[PDB]
Paper text:
The endosomal sorting complexes required for transport (ESCRTs) are membrane remodeling machinery that mediate diverse fundamental cellular processes, including the biogenesis of multivesicular body (MVB) during receptor down-regulation, enveloped virus budding, cytokinesis, plasma membrane repair, nuclear pore complex assembly, and nuclear envelope reformation. ESCRT-III is a unique protein complex in that it is metastable and conformationally dynamic, forming hetero-oligomeric filaments of multiple subunits on membranes. Vps20 nucleates the homo-oligomerization of the most abundant ESCRT-III subunit, Snf7, which then recruits Vps24 and Vps2. We then crystallized and solved X-ray crystal structures of Snf7core in two conformations at 1.6 Å and 2.4 Å resolutions, respectively.
By selectively removing its autoinhibitory C-terminus, we determine the first crystal structure of the Snf7 core domain in the active conformation at 1.6 Å resolution. Surprisingly, rather than adopting a rigid four-helix coiled-coil, the core domain undergoes a large-scale conformational rearrangement to extend into a highly elongated structure. This conformational change not only extends a cationic membrane-binding surface, but also exposes hydrophobic and electrostatic protein interacting surfaces for polymerization. Comparison of our Snf7core crystal structures we determined revealed two distinct conformations. Although both structures exhibit an open conformation, we noted two different orientations of α4 with respect to the α1/2 hairpin. In open conformation A, α4 extends in the protofilament plane, whereas in open conformation B, α4 is positioned perpendicular to the protofilament plane. Superimposing the two conformations revealed that α4 can rotate by at least ~90° along the axis of the α2/3 helix. Despite the large differences in α4 positioning, α4 makes a similar interaction with the α1/2 hairpin of a Snf7 protomer in a neighboring protofilament in both structures. This supports a model in which the assembly of the extended α2/3 helix upon Snf7 activation results in two key events: (1) α4 can no longer bind in cis to its own protomer; (2) α5 is displaced from the α1/2 hairpin.
Residue numbers in the entry: 18 to 142
Write the structure that this text describes.
Amino acid sequence: SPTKAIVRLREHINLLSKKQSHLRTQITNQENEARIFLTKGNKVMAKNALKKKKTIEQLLSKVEGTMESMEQQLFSIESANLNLETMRAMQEGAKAMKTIHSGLDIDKVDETMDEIREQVELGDE
């Protein structure tokens, strides 16, 4: 069902937002480790901590892209559903209009209408 897909997409996005928060924390942690290494005079290990920070930032970007893709999919589904709702309302409205336009069991107005239409249109060819 559309509802099923929608709730699952939201659940997935929620989890990815938690992964986002976790990765941001890990990025700050790498910065922290780098500063401490520099205060120790170990530029090699500071650089190594910042290389890892860069890798984590790359993964954070991929998490963000995954979330965006799911949000777009969710929007598409919600939009399609509203379109279906409009379509069903229009078809039931059209049914009601047909019933009203055949509302006369008395007497032969529709056929006369069509006859006069064609007379009026006869000037066109």
